[PDB]
């Protein structure tokens, strides 16, 4: 906005069966 | 840790380590640490912050 900071192509995700981080790309 | 000693030799027997996480460590003083597993420890003469 007033000073730049717009970035990020990210959301984050954790597959089910617990929270199990990394899906390793789909 | 003995008095004025520079190393602590720690050895653990053969054990499964399935679902082991890290370790943590800190140093205490013997007189400031009470012995749990006793109803009374008659040699505990401390009462500051344990």
């Amino acid at each position: 906005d007033i000073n730049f900071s717009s970035l990020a192509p990210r959301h984050g995700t954790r597959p089910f069966m617990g929270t199990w981080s990394d899906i390793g790309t789909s | 840790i003995p008095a004025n000693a520079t190393n602590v030799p720690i050895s653990i027997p053969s054990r499964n380590w399935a679902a082991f996480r890290g370790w943590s460590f800190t140093r205490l003083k013997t007189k400031e640490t009470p012995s749990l597993g006793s109803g009374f420890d008659p040699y505990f003469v401390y009462s500051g912050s344990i």
Binding site: - | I1, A5, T6, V8, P9, G22, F25
Partner: protein, 49 residues
Amino acid sequence: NFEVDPMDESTLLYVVFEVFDVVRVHQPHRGVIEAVYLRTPFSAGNATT
């Protein structure tokens, strides 16, 4: 193995081995309570019943 500074008084080393302490409890009927307690890398009942 650990190397520590000299102390002029006796000291202890507190080593914590981080595990899972599962405390798990079930009631199957009124006034009945049951439990099973299990830990993984260090556990009790691992050389006796």
